[PDB]
């Protein structure tokens, strides 16, 4: 019907464009550029195929996708592949899939359809979303996946921050939870683990944090115009080669991207559309500020790539399939 927001589409295209450009120097292996190019074609075709759906059908599979995502997060710990100390993928040869992507896209719908009703603010405000979040994060910490669990916990927070808003009770709850859990884990933490966490907060320990400390020096190489990885550190490769006058251009597009995500989130009148589009823009922005925070030596290392820049077999498709569902619920904001 050509009633989308092309400004949001252009911002997506302009960053994936620099994505392949930055993948000219980062991951120069032509075998890698092929699997990324075919990932965009499937990422754009899937989002094109998702447009052949209605919003009611989308929210009709909220609990099915949520319940199916739990079946995958419980099955990934059995017949999964361990890539970096954790089984969190399904690779049967030419296939590449992660059960954490369906968990995020499934929990966003499930917690939007459910929280459309009244949340009992006194005690049970943090009951239904807590009952729908712990099974997800619990099956992620048993991988283990700390980066993916933080995106989930931040997305659920955004949904509750739009509907619940227990500001007085919420902040006091976090201050208590942030003091009792460290007081319990630190005594039971091993010296191998205690030093590990202390090295995460302060990155000045070379044998593990040398490359991550080198990132802070690598970025500041060029101004006004060997890294550990090309995935978890796309920005460092890009920030170093393009100086500072470029860095603002990337931060600009990502700033404008998260703006139209929140802007279109306001144009939707229905509550579940407010929740779903806020939890998506929150889940996407949280990855950016964390990924660039790790690169800029501010946020602790979590192991999360940067959208629209990272090399992803299924991550690019999943993020594009996520953007398609955003354009779906926007054109369906009026009709029932």
């Amino acid at each position: 019907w050509l009633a989308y927001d092309w400004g949001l589409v252009f911002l997506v295209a302009a960053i994936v464009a620099l994505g392949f450009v930055n993948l000219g120097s980062a991951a120069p292996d032509p075998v890698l550029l092929y699997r990324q190019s075919v990932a965009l074609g499937l990422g754009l075709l899937l989002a094109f195929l998702l447009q052949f759906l209605s919003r009611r059908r989308l929210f009709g599979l909220a609990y099915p996708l949520y319940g199916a995502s739990l079946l995958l997060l419980a099955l990934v710990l059995v017949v999964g592949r361990e890539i970096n100390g954790a089984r969190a993928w399904f690779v049967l040869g030419p296939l590449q899939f992660q059960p954490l992507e369906l968990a995020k896209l499934g929990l966003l719908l499930a917690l939007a359809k459910a929280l459309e009703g009244r949340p009992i603010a006194r005690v049970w405000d943090y009951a239904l979303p807590a009952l729908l979040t712990l099974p997800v994060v619990g099956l992620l910490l048993l991988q283990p996946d700390l980066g993916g669990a933080l995106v989930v916990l931040f997305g659920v927070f955004v949904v509750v921050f739009v509907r619940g808003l227990p500001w007085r009770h919420l902040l006091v709850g976090l201050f208590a939870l942030a003091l009792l859990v460290p007081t319990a884990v630190w005594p039971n933490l091993k010296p191998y683990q205690r030093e590990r966490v202390l090295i995460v907060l302060d990155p000045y320990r070379d044998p593990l944090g040398q490359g991550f400390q080198v990132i802070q020096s690598t970025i500041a190489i060029g101004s006004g115009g060997i890294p550990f990885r090309h995935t978890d550190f796309v920005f460092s490769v890009w920030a170093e080669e393009w100086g500072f006058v470029g860095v603002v251009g990337l931060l600009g597009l990502y700033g404008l991207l998260l703006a139209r995500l929140f802007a279109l989130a306001l144009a939707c009148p229905r509550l579940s559309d407010r929740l779903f589009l806020s939890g998506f823009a929150g889940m996407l922005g949280f990855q950016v500020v964390v990924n660039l925070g790790v690169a800029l030596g501010v946020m602790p290392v979590t192991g999360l790539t940067l959208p629209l820049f990272s090399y992803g077999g299924s991550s690019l498709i999943a993020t594009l399939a996520g953007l398609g569902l955003v354009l779906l619920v926007h054109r369906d904001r009026y009709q029932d």
């Binding site: 101004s223 500020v289 660039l292």
Partner: protein
């Protein structure tokens, strides 16, 4: 319903602004910190070693430090300016080996400039620099101790293998303070591979310098006086037929009773702390660890039988409970019958009437036999009350690791079953009244001060912060009586021949402990002795000397204290010139 979304839009806006601000910091404010000389020069990052602190005593005599170890290594076998090197090095030839080998280790400060002019910056001749802990004035290991590299178990705690972990009694207590922050730097490397500019990214902390209460003068005297005791230990064991057993086991402590500072602490057989430190793998140190003896343990802090030294506390508890007045009457007979067996005295004839002052002086055992025989069952529990009150049961507060001193009570024997005949052997110190010379040195310091129970501490100042001493007072109604009996021991008791003609009026008591092994005539040589009883213009001092199985505390331990006391107050010998 919408205002909360404006906040997230504002939050992610300022978050990307802070990221834009942090980036601008590194890009603009720090570009001089990441200059590349307008060429494709890569950047290497190397950590900076941590200069460990310097251990030194009061008055500034360094006892431990680390510096550079300069070595000459060469590969290939090129002449260079060989005619000048051979007379300088004294090797007269270049041993042609395939692998890199070292020539003239420990290059002195005068040879280094001359070598540097002949180094010529060539590929074969260079000067590798190394860090190693250097003890300019080495002090007895069991007290001072050694240094090893980071163990595999310790590496996981976040310590680099180039770090030095001190298992030393003194260097472990100071290890958290001595250790410096291992800094990190990054240097611009040219295409040729040369150093161009250094960049400090973590400034190294050079550790902290600890000032000890030890005196290097009294420390040499203590370790020295341990050896002439061997000549006296072998002499005493000769009269028993036992072998010469020339091993010099024992220790000695000499501290200040007022300020609680320890001024001389040594053990034997001590070792050389420079052994474990400088050399990569010294084989002689490996034999020290597998030693059948105990060359690493400090015998000043290990529990041993105190014997006649503990009887000074038995008299204290006897006077504070009210069992005897300071002017009681007991005849020091040669033999006493407890009721089951005869309790033997150290002598064999009648000594005469004695008081508490006369009992400590002549070290009479038959005194404490008759005095405890009044209430043998209740005093033993009350004995340990005052004993732990004087500083014999609890810890001394030393920074070096210390062992537990066991004091016997009725409750302890139940968990170990009690017989009344044990009290008399416990009153003198036979009944497993295990104590340490450090605790024993403190028991004399309390009575010499007359109430104050100062805490022992090797450290006088960490960094620049003067460590203040912690005191504690004990309830003592009659202190002078114990003080007179201690000088009456020097004036008229056992120490009559050594310290009677001594200039400084000294008080003390000798000690011999029937060893539990065989009781075959070789006892534990003990003697305690504190400073000027009378107000002579001399600083106070307490000295205690112990020797394992040395025997004859009057013959072995008493002269050892006379030596250390002579070194402290500067007592001249046969120096008529």
């Amino acid at each position: 319903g919408t205002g909360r979304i404006h906040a997230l839009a504002l939050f992610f806006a300022l978050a990307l602004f802070l990221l834009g601000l942090r980036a601008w910091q590194l890009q603009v404010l720090e570009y001089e910190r990441y200059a590349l000389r307008s060429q494709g020069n890569y950047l290497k990052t190397e950590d900076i070693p941590a200069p460990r602190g310097k251990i030194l005593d009061r008055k500034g005599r360094v006892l431990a430090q680390d510096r550079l170890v300069v070595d000459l290594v060469y590969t290939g076998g090129e002449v260079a300016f060989k005619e000048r090197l051979l007379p300088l090095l004294g090797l007269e030839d270049l041993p042609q080996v395939t692998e890199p080998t070292v020539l003239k280790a420990g290059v002195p400060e005068a040879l280094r400039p001359t070598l540097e002019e002949l180094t010529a910056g060539q590929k074969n001749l260079y000067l590798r620099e190394r860090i190693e802990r250097y003890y300019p004035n080495p002090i007895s290991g069991p007290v001072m101790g050694y240094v090893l590299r980071a163990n595999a178990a310790q590496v996981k705690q976040g310590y680099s293998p180039e770090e030095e972990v001190g298992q030393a009694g003194l260097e472990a207590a100071l290890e958290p303070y001595l250790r410096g922050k291992r800094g990190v730097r990054a240097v611009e490397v040219n295409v040729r591979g040369e150093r161009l500019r250094e960049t400090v990214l973590e400034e190294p902390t050079p550790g902290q310098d600890v000032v000890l209460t030890l005196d290097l003068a009294l420390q040499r005297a203590a370790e020295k006086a341990l050896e002439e005791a061997l000549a006296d230990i072998n002499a005493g064991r000769r009269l028993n037929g036992l072998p010469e057993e020339k091993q010099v086991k024992g220790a000695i402590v000499a501290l200040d009773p007022t300020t609680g500072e320890v001024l001389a602490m040594a053990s034997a057989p001590s070792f050389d702390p420079n052994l474990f430190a400088k050399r990569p793998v010294p084989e002689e140190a490996k034999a020290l660890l597998e030693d059948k003896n105990l060359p690493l343990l400090n015998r000043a802090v290990q529990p041993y039988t105190p014997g006649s030294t503990f009887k000074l506390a038995t008299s204290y508890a006897l006077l504070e409970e009210g069992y005897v007045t300071p002017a009681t009457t007991y005849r020091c007979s040669p033999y006493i019958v407890f009721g089951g067996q005869v309790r033997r005295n150290w002598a064999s004839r009648d000594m005469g009437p004695m008081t508490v002052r006369e009992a400590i002086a002549w070290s009479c055992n038959t005194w404490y036999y008759q005095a405890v025989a009044q209430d043998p069952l209740g005093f033993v529990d009350r004995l340990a009350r005052r004993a732990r009150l004087l500083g014999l049961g609890e810890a001394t507060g030393l920074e070096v690791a210390e062992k537990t001193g066991l004091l016997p009570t009725r409750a302890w024997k139940r968990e170990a079953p009690w017989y009344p005949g044990e009290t008399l052997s416990v009153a003198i110190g036979q009944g497993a009244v295990l104590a340490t010379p450090a605790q024993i040195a403190r028991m004399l310091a309390t009575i010499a001060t007359g109430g104050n129970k100062p805490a022992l501490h090797l450290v006088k100042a960490i960094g620049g912060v003067p460590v203040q001493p912690r005191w504690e007072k004990v309830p003592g109604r009659y202190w002078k009586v114990l003080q007179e009996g201690l000088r009456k021991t020097v004036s008229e008791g056992t120490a009559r021949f050594v310290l009677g003609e001594f200039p400084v009026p000294t008080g003390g008591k000798t000690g011999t402990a029937e060893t539990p092994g065989k009781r075959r005539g070789l006892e534990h040589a003990w003697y305690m002795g504190y400073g000027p009883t009378d107000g002579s213009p001399y600083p106070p001092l307490v000295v205690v000397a112990f020797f394992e199985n040395g025997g004859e505390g009057s013959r072995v331990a008493l002269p050892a204290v006379r030596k250390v006391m002579a070194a402290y107050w500067g007592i001249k010998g046969s120096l008529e010139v």
